[PDB]
Ligand binder design. Sequence first.
Ligand SMILES: O=[N+]([O-])/C=C1\NCCN1Cc1ccc(Cl)nc1
Ligand SMILES: O=[N+]([O-])/C=C1\NCCN1Cc1ccc(Cl)nc1
Ligand SMILES: O=[N+]([O-])/C=C1\NCCN1Cc1ccc(Cl)nc1
Ligand SMILES: O=[N+]([O-])/C=C1\NCCN1Cc1ccc(Cl)nc1
Ligand SMILES: O=[N+]([O-])/C=C1\NCCN1Cc1ccc(Cl)nc1
Lengths: 209, 207, 208, 207, 207
Amino acid sequence: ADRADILYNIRQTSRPDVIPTQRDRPVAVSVSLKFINILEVNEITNEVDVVFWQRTTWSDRTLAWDSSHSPDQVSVPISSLWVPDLAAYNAISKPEVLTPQLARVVSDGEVLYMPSIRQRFSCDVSGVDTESGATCRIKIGSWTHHSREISVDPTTENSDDSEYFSQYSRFEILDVTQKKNSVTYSCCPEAYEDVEVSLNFRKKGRSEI
Amino acid sequence: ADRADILYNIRQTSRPDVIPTQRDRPVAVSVSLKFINILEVNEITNEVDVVFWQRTTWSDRTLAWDSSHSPDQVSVPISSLWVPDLAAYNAISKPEVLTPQLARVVSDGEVLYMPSIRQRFSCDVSGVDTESGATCRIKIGSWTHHSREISVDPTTENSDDSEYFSQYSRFEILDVTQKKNSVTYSCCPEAYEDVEVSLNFRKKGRS
Amino acid sequence: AADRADILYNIRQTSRPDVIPTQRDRPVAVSVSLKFINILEVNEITNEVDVVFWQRTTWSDRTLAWDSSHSPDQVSVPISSLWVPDLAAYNAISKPEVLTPQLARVVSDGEVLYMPSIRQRFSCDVSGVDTESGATCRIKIGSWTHHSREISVDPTTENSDDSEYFSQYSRFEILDVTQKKNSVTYSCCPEAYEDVEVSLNFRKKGRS
Amino acid sequence: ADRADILYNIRQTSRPDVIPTQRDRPVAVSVSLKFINILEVNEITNEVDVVFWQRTTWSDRTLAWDSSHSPDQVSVPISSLWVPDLAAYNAISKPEVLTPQLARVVSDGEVLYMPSIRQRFSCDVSGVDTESGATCRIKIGSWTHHSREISVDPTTENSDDSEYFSQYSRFEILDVTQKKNSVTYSCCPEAYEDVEVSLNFRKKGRS
Amino acid sequence: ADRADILYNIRQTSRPDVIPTQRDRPVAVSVSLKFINILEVNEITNEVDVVFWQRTTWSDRTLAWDSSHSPDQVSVPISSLWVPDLAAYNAISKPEVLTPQLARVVSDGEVLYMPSIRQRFSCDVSGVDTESGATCRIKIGSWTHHSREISVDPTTENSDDSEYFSQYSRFEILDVTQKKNSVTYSCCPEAYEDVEVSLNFRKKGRS
Ligand SMILES: O=[N+]([O-])/C=C1\NCCN1Cc1ccc(Cl)nc1
Ligand SMILES: O=[N+]([O-])/C=C1\NCCN1Cc1ccc(Cl)nc1
Ligand SMILES: O=[N+]([O-])/C=C1\NCCN1Cc1ccc(Cl)nc1
Ligand SMILES: O=[N+]([O-])/C=C1\NCCN1Cc1ccc(Cl)nc1
Ligand SMILES: O=[N+]([O-])/C=C1\NCCN1Cc1ccc(Cl)nc1
């Protein structure tokens, strides 16, 4: 079959509001952040505008097909498949999606979605104009799916932090580290996993002593 | 059955425009605010910009299913469900929902919806810069349903008021008290239950 | 023996959201009454005011009536399932920000009430806002496409305390509010358009 | 028949995505503007904010009905009708439609749509503070329909230029002239018509 | 055959969510930007605000029809057609489309979509206040379709960069070059084609 088939058959088996739990185990969702820009820093309100590619991967076997005589990958609108309800806990604005909202689907069910998002956060901005720089931490995890339904882990990949960071930004990234956590709230006895991304950055062109 | 059948049935029996009233009693809705941040405050205009989690709970028995051998909790888009028409009587901006608009439904018909919201209000800001701080009161209750259709009560959760409040904020929380109240309009005898959330806060300082 | 669901269903099957509920030929009599709640961004230089008001809108569609002797007399219904007056604030300079859930209240006699809380910017006389006499900002609301024979507006001059629901925390206070009614004829359509002109007399607070 | 029947037919015959070409002639679209306010002038960046009524008329015979035993005209949501894809060429902000998006359809097929729009334009603001004022020119015409598909002409009237212009604006209209124009693009050999509206305005003097 | 049939047929054959690939050769999409305005520029943050016409073209054979006795072109809502998933790799604000979202389709299946877009970008603004000016580069290409699926090339046509540029802008265009280019991301092998538009502009001012 061709691509027109693959989409047709995907539109059938897929249920965008039904999380693809396999057997009985959380859907493993990987979240890796690639910072592109730092636009508005306010050391007085501790708020920063950030631009980043949120690489998100997970598997949905209800999507898998045979790619022997058909493409191994196709681009699909995210409104046509289940997507993790991730949220940035310390975000103070809705996530502004800058790119077309298409996901990449492989015939084995692996799914990739990597939007470029622009968002404002509440975090530690103090130190931004100092050698050590400021460290702003961003918490991302599912909003309604606890640890047994969704587990989030930082796609561990020793990659250059400023690999895609605009060379024209007033800031420079000193260092980015992705960590995994687990919070239990009052509503429920089960834990909610998340990933803390600590972005260490500072202003460029500071005077030397 | 699996999560798909559950979600299938929920979607097939849910009446998003009909208030789920069992018998003649109103729908019991619980509303609890958890302050996450205080973004901008203006003492001169008595206006504040705040972020909070609006824990909301109610019941809809028609949605219930047998969880003997199946999941007894699923995530559901609120557009597929009846949701209480709550409004902040003193909000000067429409609520900005920052999180995925999904509710959580237990097999017993209990529905939990807790959106993180950013919204501006017209309240008393005086004293924000004093040790006593200021006390901004926020009233939330149904907009069109009165006491016989919807009852509102604070989810008494003896917990820390700053448990989830941002440490990087410029303000700090002195105390939060959520009291049950009621509003009435000249035209009519009917009353609308609400919850008065008193946020006692002040600007961080050591002087 | 009808539950709210049966009530809504009968409404959804007879109400025509895009069709004005005209009786015979007579125009649909709409009532418009504003209740001010707050006055925010005021500018005497540019003559622009930011206001929050409850816009009480009432009319009737008897085809939606039912017997409430042993059933609910009213129900809340999404305005999208109903026909609603195409009202517009003529001197507004920003589209209205509806702060409340967009639900209407339909009564068993066919009466329909819709009261959204609205935040909207207006172009009006702001001079003297800081004088004992204050400023008088006039707001004109009326149908945008329905002329006097299809829709008529009546300011429900339900004498009340003008600042009854007005924010105490506002930097301003209401001195007096007056509901007026007017009619205009544009070079498009022979018959006139009816509107209600609300005069808002307010001023900056300050002990003196 | 009744208004509901009329709206029923319209929804049936009308093809909102198809231009109502009579015979094989282009659809004649009259465009006229009635300035209501001038809000955010900036003589440095040559940008202005304007509120205006865009009187737009045209014909769509495939919507006509027998008004012998029925109303002559009705209000219709523009989503149920084909509408000219007009764009203000020098606009720098999307149009902010401040009014209910209903058009007026007459029995013969005449359509009138007049939204109040607020939009920011890039044009000559120089001299706004002088006595002769400035002259900002706004160009409005179809975006994808050329001369042989759509023709636009300024249907002027006997109305005063500031007949509906707010007296509370910091600016006053000195004169408005609306000329028809025509441009050819690399796209294709056929040109596109547009109305060019010139607004001569100035900041109000002092006592 | 009239326009009603052409659109009706498009609605029957068009797959807006399926890339119209001929056999296995990538879809040939042409991009070229026409600068209309430069509204804001920050010498310190290296950010510009601009307005441009993004002339885009490609082939969709399944849309073809016979125009021997009907029109060979029609304006169609892009929501009824597959559209290239282009994105500006260095944009810091999502595109604000200023014009009606209608594409033009020729009887031979060729599609032309030219929206006027206002968008914010991160690029080199240094030298913008000098005679040689600054050079801001904008990279545009598919977001998810690598080279084997989509190829992008500039409509390299000798012309006047300032042809449709606003005379009321505070800036002026000195030269615009559009080069093809590609980008491969560590992860995966396949590369993503893109068009690199270099805008050489400067602040205008006799001195
Ligand atoms: O960094 N990457 O690995 C990949 C990319 N970065 C920018 C565009 N890009 C290609 C891409 C592939 C799949 C998806 Cl779902 N989204 C984007
Ligand atoms: O505070 N809480 O009780 C619970 C939560 N706080 C942040 C996410 N969270 C989990 C959660 C569960 C169900 C629903 Cl409907 N929404 C959110
Ligand atoms: O003033 N009143 O009579 C009534 C009200 N004022 C604000 C909310 N309110 C309740 C209400 C009633 C009917 C409708 Cl349709 N919407 C809201
Ligand atoms: O100026 N006019 O001719 C007409 C009007 N100006 C403001 C409202 N108005 C009435 C009106 C009629 C038809 C339509 Cl489609 N829209 C508005
Ligand atoms: O530059 N051009 O070739 C063409 C145009 N520039 C502005 C409007 N215009 C007309 C036009 C043609 C096709 C399409 Cl799809 N959209 C607009």
